Enzyme design. Structure first.
Site, mmCIF file in Angstrom:
data_model
loop_
_atom_site.group_PDB
_atom_site.id
_atom_site.type_symbol
_atom_site.label_atom_id
_atom_site.label_comp_id
_atom_site.label_asym_id
_atom_site.label_seq_id
_atom_site.Cartn_x
_atom_site.Cartn_y
_atom_site.Cartn_z
ATOM 1 N N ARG B 112 32.675 85.159 74.582
ATOM 2 C CA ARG B 112 31.894 85.589 73.842
ATOM 3 C C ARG B 112 31.405 84.318 72.959
ATOM 4 N NH1 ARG B 112 33.881 85.986 68.177
ATOM 5 N NH2 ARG B 112 32.389 88.118 67.782
ATOM 6 N N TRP B 119 35.028 71.663 66.319
ATOM 7 C CA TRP B 119 36.403 71.346 66.587
ATOM 8 C C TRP B 119 36.962 71.414 67.924
ATOM 9 C CZ3 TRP B 119 41.222 72.676 63.930
ATOM 10 C CH2 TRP B 119 41.561 74.437 63.918
ATOM 11 N N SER B 166 29.405 73.266 58.884
ATOM 12 C CA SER B 166 30.018 72.275 59.709
ATOM 13 C C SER B 166 31.329 72.870 60.120
ATOM 14 C CB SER B 166 30.144 70.944 59.283
ATOM 15 O OG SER B 166 30.558 69.916 60.377
ATOM 16 N N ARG B 237 27.902 86.963 57.486
ATOM 17 C CA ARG B 237 27.489 86.113 58.611
ATOM 18 C C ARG B 237 26.968 87.107 59.698
ATOM 19 N NH1 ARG B 237 33.432 85.008 60.061
ATOM 20 N NH2 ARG B 237 33.332 86.887 59.009
ATOM 21 N N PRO B 238 25.617 86.619 60.192
ATOM 22 C CA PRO B 238 24.990 87.389 61.181
ATOM 23 C C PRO B 238 25.923 87.794 62.431
ATOM 24 C CG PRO B 238 23.435 85.497 60.460
ATOM 25 C CD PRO B 238 24.874 85.287 59.725
ATOM 26 N N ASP B 272 39.245 81.096 60.149
ATOM 27 C CA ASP B 272 38.650 82.407 59.684
ATOM 28 C C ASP B 272 39.464 83.603 60.157
ATOM 29 O OD1 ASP B 272 37.070 80.984 61.680
ATOM 30 O OD2 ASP B 272 36.473 83.002 62.120
ATOM 31 N N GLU B 456 42.483 81.855 74.257
ATOM 32 C CA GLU B 456 42.118 81.300 72.730
ATOM 33 C C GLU B 456 43.522 81.144 71.831
ATOM 34 O OE1 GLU B 456 39.347 83.473 69.984
ATOM 35 O OE2 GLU B 456 40.000 85.444 71.186
HETATM 36 O O1 LIG Z 1 37.193 78.803 69.538
HETATM 37 C C1 LIG Z 1 35.909 79.380 69.003
HETATM 38 C C2 LIG Z 1 36.274 79.288 67.413
HETATM 39 C C3 LIG Z 1 36.977 78.277 66.568
HETATM 40 O O2 LIG Z 1 36.029 77.101 66.685
HETATM 41 C C4 LIG Z 1 37.554 78.984 65.382
HETATM 42 O O3 LIG Z 1 38.550 78.040 64.788
HETATM 43 C C5 LIG Z 1 38.171 79.998 66.045
HETATM 44 C C6 LIG Z 1 37.791 81.376 64.913
HETATM 45 O O4 LIG Z 1 39.049 82.368 64.865
HETATM 46 C C7 LIG Z 1 36.496 82.280 65.703
HETATM 47 O O5 LIG Z 1 35.526 81.341 64.755
HETATM 48 C C8 LIG Z 1 34.166 81.630 65.509
HETATM 49 O O6 LIG Z 1 33.877 82.749 65.517
HETATM 50 C C9 LIG Z 1 33.555 83.536 64.209
HETATM 51 C C10 LIG Z 1 33.083 84.934 64.522
HETATM 52 O O7 LIG Z 1 33.864 85.654 65.414
HETATM 53 C C11 LIG Z 1 32.453 82.744 63.606
HETATM 54 O O8 LIG Z 1 32.196 83.522 62.292
HETATM 55 C C12 LIG Z 1 32.815 81.242 63.193
HETATM 56 O O9 LIG Z 1 32.013 80.604 62.658
HETATM 57 C C13 LIG Z 1 33.214 80.767 64.702
HETATM 58 O O10 LIG Z 1 33.647 79.313 64.425
HETATM 59 C C14 LIG Z 1 36.886 81.835 67.122
HETATM 60 N N1 LIG Z 1 37.147 80.434 66.806
#
Ligand SMILES: OC[C@@H]1[C@@H](O)[C@H](O)[C@H]2[C@H](O)[C@@H](O[C@H]3O[C@H](CO)[C@@H](O)[C@H](O)[C@H]3O)CN21
Ligand SMILES: OC[C@@H]1[C@@H](O)[C@H](O)[C@H]2[C@H](O)[C@@H](O[C@H]3O[C@H](CO)[C@@H](O)[C@H](O)[C@H]3O)CN21
EC number: 3.2.1.28
Lengths: 500, 504
Positions: B112, B119, B166, B237-238, B272, B456
């Site tokens: 997705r 990062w 960011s 968040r959209p 998050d 992941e």
């Molecule tokens: O591997 C992609 C990203 C990583 O940058 C981040 O640390 C980790 C996080 O658990 C998820 O974050 C992304 O998805 C969210 C929605 O599912 C967004 O709200 C967030 O802004 C985005 O970085 C998956 N991860």
């Protein structure tokens, strides 16, 4: 991107050094190259032996022009002076240099005058009334098209077409501008700009669907009983680029309050048009006590009512009766909300609603005529408003903005053209012709007197009798035309205000 | 003009499609592409509601987003073979697309995650560099420099809905990575963009009074300057619309805008979500991200100041180099005083509400070692604390609190494994560093052997895989990069391994 973000600490340094006597000047400066590379260059050079900041600016920026003065010919009438000024106040900026704070617009537009070298949202309505009155419908259409385009590009009409105005709108008159154009073009105009009026409404109401009772978000408030109203809001919480040093000084003078909250309220008062006023201040002596975002404005909510009524009318014109009904339902809900939360029954006048104390305010300001202007006011309350106007706000040289002489711009003893017109028209809406005429005569007499002496019209007038003061002046010129027409017979128009 | 995020662009239509859950992933409609001017789509929507099938309306007006590995690949081969599969090239995008154009090809995380991530990209670029793909490394540095040039910062990813924030700042470290191949040319070249990024993080600092915060900066009572995570917007968040609204709705007595700001700011932190930001790790509506001074962020800011000093010297400005060095020194002092817990003997976040260093030990505590800010004696204590509390059979635990959130026990995340490993190695703590590496690599290899994938994140407690509101995703950018780096570390330089050995 606004100049403070584009240039970083460089913008801060130039503003604080007060290289130019107007903070707006460096906000309007055009970088000669990428601001990211200017900043890099500045960081290297700044600690070089003999570094001169003024020279650095001269080399890296084109500045606004400054030496020029308009010279009218002698003895022109008030009306001819105004009518001939339109080309002078007109700008055409379809393309702008990269990194200019000035934002391009597809069509020509009238600016207010002086340091205001960009289109202004609410000024443009009163200005368009003048343009229309004197037969300049193409310029009226140009300006409607511009605002429609800003809605299309930015999602709302910014305070003006500057990067540093993008974070906010202003008192919303777009829907009233579309209706003004429809006076000339018929229902075609309501149909053409229905999608843009709807998108502007979406801007003002953004987030309303998920807003819980007793909370606020952006430009929307929902009271405990679910009543929906709007407030002024700016999306940023920093000093205004165009008033950089003033704002920092304001926040610094109250270290007991987060500066971000003060900046938010300063920027939100700028969105209100009334920057600044005792109307927003816990303490008229101290600007650092303004709490704009905690105040539900009676003028803004009147304007929202009119927007909802116009959305209904345009929907009907497009042949969608069901949708017109939906907007009528929203308008009725707004009207009930105005009548409940924006009317002070103890004093007998309209007023803002205070979210902190959960009560309608006692303070009477010129905003209180807005419900009459938009036809939201009950007839008996319009009559009470005529009394309140004569008792409190009607002065020898026009309608006072408030009764508090705070030293701020949007307060006694200052009279502002837009307010004179809204009051005059709202009183007329309810057959309160005597007070409406008194405002028009008193304000017009004030305008003529200054014009007689100085051969100019200015942004605002002292109503006690009949940055530095700015000349032109867009909304003053428009309102003057309209009022001149009102006070003399239609068949024997006057070009100057009669001495008697 | 860059389009507004999808909620702004589409007004209430967006809200309605998300709430109706027409698609099982909230991110799906956030990535939908309008077939015409959204202003006109919204006008049509309001009209058509007054004359209706939402799903059909969406089908007409939007275009919605749309692997079998070769036989018998070793772990290393599978990773090296996947780079093209994970690469995208989006120099031009449709009008109204939430996808933001970039001038060069880029590697995305996978699944997705159909856009570049800030990062993640550093760890991914370590893998690209390791396996000889320097052209892609230079492409991705250029792309991020371009975003700083165009937006003023590097967004969470190249999506309109990520523009307001960011992520953990690794750009300066990416520039140093290119410099490993190119020499100091890379520093000279991207110095202006590295400076512009610092200005973003430090924005407003010159006028900030002691005891106050603004945007991404905090100034403590004694004048100490540190940074925090921040998002410029205060709405759901959209890409997580219905989840965030539910969260705010669950505490109607706290202004929803505060909850939204804190949710978005936790996404800016990368973590998050985590017990780390929450008063109660069992309840997400208690998060207060923006009142917490993060030890990892401030370690990265220290590194940024250090690289800026180095780059300034490379460009020939020792006076400027010295200025950055002075800033870095102040940051180091700030870290040692406000982001070290002397009661517990570990690095930790600082709480702006209680005005105290937090007691919780998380993987963020290794960041001061990673960036060489830590005193030697404290690095030694961190080695013991890691071994005692965070080392698990399948890798380094993110925290020791099993909250149900993704950035918490029992989850192990590649970037944190690498940061810990390298931090410990920087201070000669080889045993613990190799333990992290061997444990995480064994976890990765076991899953690869049976499921022919990398993902992941991993369960460090049980080994294997599978909190979160979306299914476990595969690819996976940072896991693949870190895996390569660790594979190289654990076998002799001269006799490298293509699979993790079953016996040490
Ligand atoms: O591997 C992609 C990203 C990583 O940058 C981040 O640390 C980790 C996080 O658990 C998820 O974050 C992304 O998805 C969210 C929605 O599912 C967004 O709200 C967030 O802004 C985005 O970085 C998956 N991860
Ligand atoms: O006539 C131009 C504007 C008018 O729109 C507004 O009501 C009145 C106000 O007193 C001033 O506002 C403008 O200038 C400020 C800087 O001096 C800006 O911060 C503000 O956003 C802008 O509308 C002059 N007026």
């Amino acid at each position: 991107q606004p100049p403070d973000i584009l240039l970083g600490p460089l913008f801060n340094d130039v503003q604080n050094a007060k290289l130019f006597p107007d903070q707006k000047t460096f906000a309007d400066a055009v970088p000669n190259s990428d601001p990211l590379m200017i900043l890099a260059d500045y960081r290297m050079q700044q600690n070089q032996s003999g570094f001169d900041l003024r020279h650095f600016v001269n080399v890296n920026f084109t500045l606004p022009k400054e030496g020029e003065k308009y010279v009218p010919p002698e003895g022109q009438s008030l009306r001819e002076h105004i009518d001939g000024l339109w080309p002078v106040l007109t700008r055409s900026t379809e393309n702008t240099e990269k990194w200019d704070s000035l934002l391009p617009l597809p069509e020509p537009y009238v600016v207010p005058g002086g340091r205001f070298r960009e289109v202004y949202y609410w000024d443009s309505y009163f200005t368009m009334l003048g343009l229309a009155e004197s037969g300049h419908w193409d310029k009226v259409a140009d300006m409607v098209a511009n605002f429609a385009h800003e809605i299309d590009t930015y999602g709302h009409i910014p305070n003006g077409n500057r990067s540093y105005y993008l974070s906010r709108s202003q008192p919303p008159f777009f829907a009233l501008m579309v209706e003004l154009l429809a006076q000339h073009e018929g229902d075609a105009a309501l149909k053409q700009y229905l999608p843009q009026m709807q998108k502007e409404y979406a801007y003002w109401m953004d987030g309303v669907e998920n807003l819980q009772a007793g909370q606020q978000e952006k430009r929307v408030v929902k009271l405990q009983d679910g009543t929906l109203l709007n407030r002024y809001w700016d999306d940023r919480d920093t000093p205004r680029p165009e008033s950089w040093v003033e704002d920092i000084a304001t926040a610094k003078s109250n270290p007991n309050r987060p500066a971000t909250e003060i900046y938010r309220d300063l920027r939100s008062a700028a969105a209100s048009g009334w920057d600044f006023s005792s109307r927003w201040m816990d303490n008229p002596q101290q600007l650092n006590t303004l709490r704009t975002t905690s105040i539900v404005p009676v003028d803004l909510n009147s304007l929202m009512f009119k927007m909802e009524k116009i959305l209904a009318r345009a929907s009907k014109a497009a042949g969608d009766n069901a949708m017109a009904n939906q907007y009528e339902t929203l308008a009725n809900a707004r009207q009930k909300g105005i009548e409940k939360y924006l009317w002070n029954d103890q004093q007998g006048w309209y007023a803002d609603y205070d979210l902190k104390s959960h009560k309608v305010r006692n303070q009477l300001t010129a905003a209180a005529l807005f419900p009459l202007y938009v036809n939201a006011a009950a007839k008996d309350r319009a009559n009470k408003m005529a009394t309140a106007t004569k008792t409190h706000l009607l002065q020898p040289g026009g309608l006072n903005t408030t009764s508090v002489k705070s030293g701020q711009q949007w307060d006694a003893p200052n009279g502002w053209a837009p307010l004179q017109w809204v009051a005059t028209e709202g009183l007329q809406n309810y057959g309160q012709k005597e007070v409406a005429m008194d405002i028009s005569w008193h304000f017009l007499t004030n305008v003529q007197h200054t014009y007689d002496r100085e051969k100019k019209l200015v942004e605002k007038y002292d109503v006690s009798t009949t940055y530095p003061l700015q000349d032109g002046f867009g909304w003053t010129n428009g309102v003057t035309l309209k009022m001149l027409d009102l006070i003399c017979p239609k068949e024997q128009p006057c070009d100057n205000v009669p001495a008697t």
